[PDB]
């Protein structure tokens, strides 16, 4: 369960980074 | 044994990494409201 939760936090972490890189679109026109 | 301890370390780590964005968000919302 520990190694399950480790890969589970590594698969969710790229989601918020992809959301931040999507928010970086609005940076480029400001 | 001590995944409780490493869990506490990653909890305080994400706390101090939320600290930087809680710092930066208000400063980024201050610098664009001077346009009046």
């Amino acid at each position: 369960a520990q190694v399950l939760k480790n890969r589970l936090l590594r698969v969710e972490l790229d989601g918020i980074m992809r959301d931040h890189l999507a928010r970086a679109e609005e940076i480029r026109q400001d | 044994a001590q995944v409780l301890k490493n869990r506490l370390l990653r909890v305080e780590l994400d706390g101090i990494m939320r600290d930087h964005l809680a710092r930066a968000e208000e400063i980024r919302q201050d610098l664009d409201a001077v346009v009046a």
């Binding site: 890969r7 698969v11 790229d14 | -």
Partner: protein, 346 residues
Amino acid sequence: MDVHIDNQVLSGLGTPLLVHLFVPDTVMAELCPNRVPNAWCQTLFSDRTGLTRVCRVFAARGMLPGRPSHRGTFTSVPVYCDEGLPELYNPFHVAALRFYDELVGELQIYYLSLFEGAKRALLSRVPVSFSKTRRAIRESRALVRGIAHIFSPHALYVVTYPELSAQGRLHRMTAVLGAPEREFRFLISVALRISASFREKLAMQAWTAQQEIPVVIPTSYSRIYKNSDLIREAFFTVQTRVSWESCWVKATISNAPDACLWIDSHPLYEEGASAWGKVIDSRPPGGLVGAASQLVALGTDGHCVHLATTSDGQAFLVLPGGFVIKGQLALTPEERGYILARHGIR
């Protein structure tokens, strides 16, 4: 990408939205020897356990991706757990596959590993497959993206691509655990009740062996196997990680089709994850003496414990040395129907 548009118009009856995926050969090689499969979709719920109908997935192997970086097999996963509107995603929600040629090997995949990478990767006439013409024009690299697998630590490629509204609704969906927590606890629960049945059968009897299967035994058997050396009989219950490969469920799936014997054999102490779910046959012209040859070849295994299940509701545990302890198999028939719906139809 042939299987992608092969089950996109067939599985549309049982499932609204269909996902296109790849399995590398390296990750699924430990699921099945010699790549013997060539599927059956059954998505089980995290908090809403239940049972669902089985969906068929057309997969064809030996055919590469568009990438030359890796070469593996093709697959597809149906998504039909989201009730009504599919805008909600269930997180920590498994999807289980039964890929097969002749039923061999199982695959489990989270919905979260699927959906996070799916957004990451971005005077008649004859009928035409409009999906086939729309698939053919993308044909690019970035349709496929590599995503780690939480069950087995390898990258599982999904192929998604701006095809139509059916995938078009898919990446717009988001929502606000316990799905593998149940299946381990369930199997260890039935293993504990079986070991308790063996405990009371050794208890109501004298602490003795009946020795159903004959085999000769040396004088040093109480030396080289120590006094009350039940180390394997201790750790047997930790060593049963799988159930649906095990012979324990092979009795329950064979009650309706008549009754043969099934064997779960394990190493005396960590000699390898040996074997799960084999047959002792009385049907073919090997006959009952041919089955007896297999059973004495079983009892002569000096480096393996053995567990026997009959299809009519009886369980046995064959020690290395020909000794055996009788036992009972019977459980609440809700769990019979639970296992029977977990495998296939009732």
